[PDB]
A paper describes a structure:
Eukaryotic genomic DNA is folded into chromatin, in which the nucleosome is the basic unit. Here we identify DEK, whose function is unknown, as a nucleosome-binding protein. Cryo-electron microscopy structures of the DEK–nucleosome complexes reveal that DEK binds the nucleosome by its tripartite DNA-binding mode on the dyad and linker DNAs and interacts with the nucleosomal acidic patch by its newly identified histone-binding region. The DEK–nucleosome interaction mediates linker DNA reorientation and induces chromatin compaction, which may facilitate PRC2 activation.
Consistent with the gel mobility shift assay and the mass photometric analysis, we obtained two structures, the complex with two DEK molecules bound to the nucleosome (DEK2–nucleosome) and that with one DEK molecule bound to the nucleosome (DEK1–nucleosome), at 2.8-Å and 3.2-Å resolutions, respectively. Consequently, the two DEK molecules are tightly bound to the nucleosome in the dual-tripartite DNA-binding form (two symmetric DEK SAP domains in a tripartite DNA-binding form). Therefore, the binding of two DEK molecules induces substantial linker DNA bending in the nucleosome, which may lead to topological changes in the nucleosomal DNA. Surprisingly, the binding of two DEK molecules to the nucleosome substantially bends the linker DNAs and compacts the chromatin conformation. This remarkable linker DNA bending found in the DEK2–nucleosome complex has not been reported for other proteins complexed with the nucleosome.
Numbering used by the authors:
A (entry chain L), H (entry chain K): 52 to 68, 78 to 188
B (entry chain D): 32 to 124
C (entry chain A), J (entry chain E): 38 to 135
D (entry chain C), F (entry chain G): 10 to 118
E (entry chain B): 18 to 102
G (entry chain H): 27 to 121
I (entry chain F): 20 to 102
DNA sequence: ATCACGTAATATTGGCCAGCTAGGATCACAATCCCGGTGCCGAGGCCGCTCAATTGGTCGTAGACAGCTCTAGCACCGCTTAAACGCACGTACGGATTCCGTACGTGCGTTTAAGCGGTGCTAGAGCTGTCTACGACCAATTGAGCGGCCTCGGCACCGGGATTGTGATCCTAGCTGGCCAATATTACGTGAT
DNA sequence: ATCACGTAATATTGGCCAGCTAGGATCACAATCCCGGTGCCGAGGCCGCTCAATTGGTCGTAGACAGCTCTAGCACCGCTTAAACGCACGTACGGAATCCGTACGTGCGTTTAAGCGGTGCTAGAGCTGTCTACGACCAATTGAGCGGCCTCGGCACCGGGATTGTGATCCTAGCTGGCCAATATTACGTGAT
């Protein structure tokens, strides 16, 4: 019954309660063609693209500039991220895909699956 | 008429635990209420135990059980130890 | 072909297990649990049937009231699903200091 | 020829009063009869708890470089100890305030 | 005669916790609720059974009775009727 | 030389046992001494509370078309009364179950 | 041989037949009501004892019971309990 | 101390935890000029237009159908609602206002304050 | 005479202070009346129990020990007032 | 010239009224309130100063703990601000109901 | 040899028909409900007994009551000043909306172990009798405890200096808006038909 | 005379220039911390004196202990499903992102009444003394309550119909995509440089 020692002092446990991933290639703001298109384009269009790029829409203010800062996708062809972007692209209306091609200087003439492939190759390596 | 309290005993314990330290009247009233509260809790549990077992007597065993029930954890253990030691000493003399 | 939309069965189960009073934990496992716990306080123990049944009634009422408070906390958070944070909050408030 | 009298406290090695505790137990109407070791054991328990609180409170007071104990120091000791805060949970201490505890989410970032 | 009974908390199964919740008015339940509830229950049971076994040893019994459990809960501030409260 | 026995409960117009309550008060070590009107008062209070509970529980049973009270009926009577549910708020009834209470926000629209 | 235990069962039966003559009660419910009676008895008697101690009085009388009732039982419950208790004490003193 | 009735049982208090306002004018869907624009347009430019007509932006699917049924603004020139729309127009970027003019067949050649006035007059009475 | 409308003496800034001592940063405007009601309830109960203990002591004066017993009853034991 | 952004002075006041122990309600208003309440239970009453001081200490401690639980409920609702619903929830879980 | 132009093969785009999705109404399936018959077992009644309740008398003391003191609660005034109040203003917060993914809910087939009933053993609850050690009680003792009084030191507060921190201001870089000049569109004059 | 088309005025848009805004860095000021110094008032000690603690003895009885009865707990077994588990799948939910409106925080100037001290009065707390009604206690008596037994009433459960809530399916309606026809682009042969 007699504990020969000091008592341990316990403590009460109280109930406590925009990273641009830089990819491979060139920024969409440096590429003369794309930069000229964004200048001619508007905040509206980049709402769908900012969703496609960073999986979230963007502030009417920090939208066009952040999309221009997009320098590529740091992941490679066949990654889980590549497949997840390809499905997103397949889920976009053909008119949207044609608008995204026009913002990236890609040819708007083509089948849905080709517009998807040509946008997805460009978003890996944005080339002037 | 003279009123009772636990003050001098708390001052003795303190001097044994902190000979450099003192205590204010208000703190002493708090310690007196604490002593009286603990006393009432333990004695109530001891009486209740005796009644549950149909005993008319309160002994060190009842107090030790009431301590086990009320005081929590290592506190209970070190209180049982200090009470067993004190009862042993008292019985030796 | 018939399948119920999520929620409908849950509400039916709610109406049912509130209309009822039987114990909801199985008795054998709860008994084994009681004995397991008691082994850490004293060995070679024995339990009356009424004692185990009392522990069971008490633990079910306790968990039921806890889940009531937890559902209240959840709803407070504009949710419908209860989460561990809700339980921790209900306990921290009831004075159990979770 | 009468032997010198030493108090029940001395015989038990305590600072708390054993006679006073035996009287309160007798005058507290807890039981018809009261053993001899009951007040001794009980006084020793009270002495132990008092000493535990005074250790913690004196530590807290030394932390604030204060030599005298005041209610705030008792509150700090009690609430900062888990077992004491457990036993003294519903207990309210006048002029003892509360523990500094600001929830993180309220802090600025 | 004597055998250790380990991993008996898991006998408080997912559907049983689900039933208890339903009796508490719960509609949707996370997946972590189950372990949180098992821990909560193990704590409650530890305290109640500690107090009951204490009352028992005090009574010089080796068997835990219903009166021990009732006194223990009554102590925890959770009075229980139907067992002689 | 001895009058016909007339029990205290009969002298008070009650059903509960006054003699038994006297005995329990004396054997509970509640007080060294117990007045004559204390057990009478206490038995009358217990009888009133019992009658209240049973009135409400029998009403509940009749609402479920039952002639025989069971624990669920007691739980209903208690939790549906403001005073009883306050008196017995920290109380648990065996096989009492719960009061049907689905929060509105869970019901569909 | 001889085994004796006490309860309040028959008195609860009597109260029931006073308020609900054509109604009955089960054994489990009767045990619950017995526990309720014992609980409220312990509560009232404990409050009465503490009252007598606070006032340094050695006796428990109708006053201490009345105060303990008014303190423990809530609201109209307390008023009606006091009424019943006073009526019973009155009838008892008129022996 | 003695009462005269029965207990008044006290009831326990348990703690209990797209309207198109039609305005004055022709629906933007019945105006073949504007309707041909929306057909040539995508859910982005209409998204800007809706963040303007009903305060809160709509859903990709609803956005379209909702802008289709704008029957005009039911309030008059000088109302608190007119002033509150005029400020929301002054707070739009001049490229947005030019995109809204192009969705309403309004001339995209004017000073900010004129683009605001010409859109606001059209949104009171959408005329073919 | 008779005191009236004295609940309002528990003023907005006093409730604000209490909250701050409780760790509160932002406060609605309805919190003030809710708190006044909560406090009036708490006091009704505590003072009922205290006045009861008083009449039972045949006193016309409320003491601190009466208040201490009342709080102990509400389950809110208080130290430093003769407990 | 200088103006603190909302929430700063609030944290400062928090640290202040937590470092301290002085009663935060003014005395005379509390005393008048106490007498008002009591006058509904018995007339021509008298209060010791210690009794009023005890009631004040008790009320402040009660409201402070209530506001702790309320701030916890609020935070649980992803809200910095406390609202009456938070108080009602805290009390319903505490057992004070209402 | 390279390049401009007309022709032919290849490719793109507008219109149309068809496919797909939305909303409302209709219909079938399942759950909930009710309603009568059955047996089953626990509720409720009866009875002998015993032990706990009642009665009547004696006695001591706990507490009601009266009287005095004096402590302390109440009331009241005036001054100071910090707190409360009221209002203006704007930031940060709460609420609403949308969207997206995936975590739960639901259904199904398989597994597993709870539940029930039955047998055997046995530890330990429960009761009784013996008796001793222990506690209660009283008388004399006495010394610890406590109220009154004095006196220094811990502390709470003031002023000065210093440090940490927050809010505001300033500078640098990028984007947006307006203005001006170049170029496309429209109306009139002129050449061809 | 009508139509087609060169040229000039008008209109639209790209380049240039300027203004605006967001982010980062810097500074000014203002709250917090440190350090003495100091007057104070409450802790801490001292003293004598009362009543609670103590020593000693004796005596009744609480409960420790042994012994016996027998209840109830435990271990084991074997079926028999009902529940649990694993898994597939899809939808409602939670979370995150965005935005807007305004409620609450902050600060200033004005008003209020809290606080503090001092003064005067008197209710009632607290104590003492008294005397007595009332509760404890004992012994004898006795009837209500407890346990055992029995025997039917309440209820659960089931099977057969009725109603209702939920989900799936069908119908009418709107929007978008693949296919087809018309037309633009590009490769190639021929002519010119």
């Amino acid at each position: 019954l007699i504990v020969e020692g000091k008592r341990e002092k316990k403590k009460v446990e109280r109930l406590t309660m925009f990273t641009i991933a830089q990819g491979k290639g060139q920024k969409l703001c440096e590429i003369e063609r794309i930069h000229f298109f964004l200048s001619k384009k508007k905040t509206d269009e980049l709402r769908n693209l900012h969703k496609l790029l960073y999986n979230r829409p963007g502030t009417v203010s920090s939208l066009k500039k952040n999309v221009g800062q997009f320098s590529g996708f740091p992941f490679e062809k066949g990654s889980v991220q590549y497949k997840k972007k390809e499905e997103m692209l397949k889920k976009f209306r053909n008119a949207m895909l044609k608008s995204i091609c026009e913002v990236l200087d890609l040819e708007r003439s083509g089948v849905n699956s080709e517009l998807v492939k040509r946008i997805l190759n460009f978003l890996m390596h944005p080339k002037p | 008429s003279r009123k009772e309290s636990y003050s001098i005993y708390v001052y003795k314990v303190l001097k044994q635990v902190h000979p450099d330290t003192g205590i204010s009247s208000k703190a002493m009233g708090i310690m007196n209420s604490f002593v009286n509260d603990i006393f009432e809790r333990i004695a109530g549990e001891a009486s209740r135990l005796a009644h549950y077992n149909k005993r008319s007597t309160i002994t060190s065993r009842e107090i030790q059980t009431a301590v086990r029930l009320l005081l929590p954890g290592e506190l209970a253990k070190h209180a049982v130890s200090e009470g067993t030691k004190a009862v042993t000493k008292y019985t030796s003399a | 072909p018939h399948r119920y939309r999520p929620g409908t069965v849950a509400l039916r189960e709610i109406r049912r297990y509130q209309k009822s009073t039987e114990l909801l934990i199985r008795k054998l496992p709860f008994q084994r649990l009681v004995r397991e716990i008691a082994q850490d306080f004293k060995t070679d123990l024995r339990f009356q049937s009424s004692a185990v049944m009392a522990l069971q009634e008490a633990c079910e009422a306790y968990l039921v009231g806890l889940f009531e408070d937890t559902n209240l906390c959840a709803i407070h958070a504009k949710r419908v699903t209860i989460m561990p944070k809700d339980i921790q909050l209900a306990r921290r408030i009831r004075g159990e200091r979770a | 020829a009468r032997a010198k009298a030493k108090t029940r406290s001395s015989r038990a090695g305590l600072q708390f009063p054993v006679g006073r505790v035996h009287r309160l137990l007798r005058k507290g109407n807890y039981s018809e009869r009261v053993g001899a070791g009951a007040p001794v054991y009980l006084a020793a328990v009270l002495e132990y708890l008092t000493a535990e609180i005074l250790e913690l409170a004196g530590n807290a007071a030394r932390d604030n470089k204060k030599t005298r104990i005041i209610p705030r120091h008792l509150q700090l000791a009690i609430r900062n100890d888990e077992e004491l805060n457990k036993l003294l949970g519903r207990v309210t201490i006048a002029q003892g305030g509360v523990l500094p505890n600001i929830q993180a989410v309220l802090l600025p970032k | 005669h004597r055998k250790v009974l380990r991993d008996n908390i898991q006998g408080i199964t997912k559907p049983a916790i689900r039933r208890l919740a339903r009796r508490g008015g719960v509609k949707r339940i996370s997946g972590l609720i189950y372990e949180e509830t098992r821990g909560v229950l193990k704590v409650f049971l530890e305290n109640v059974i500690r107090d009951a076994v204490t009352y028992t040893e005090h009574a010089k019994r080796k068997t835990v009775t219903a009166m021990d459990v009732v006194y223990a809960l009554k102590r925890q501030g959770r009075t229980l009727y139907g067992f002689g409260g």
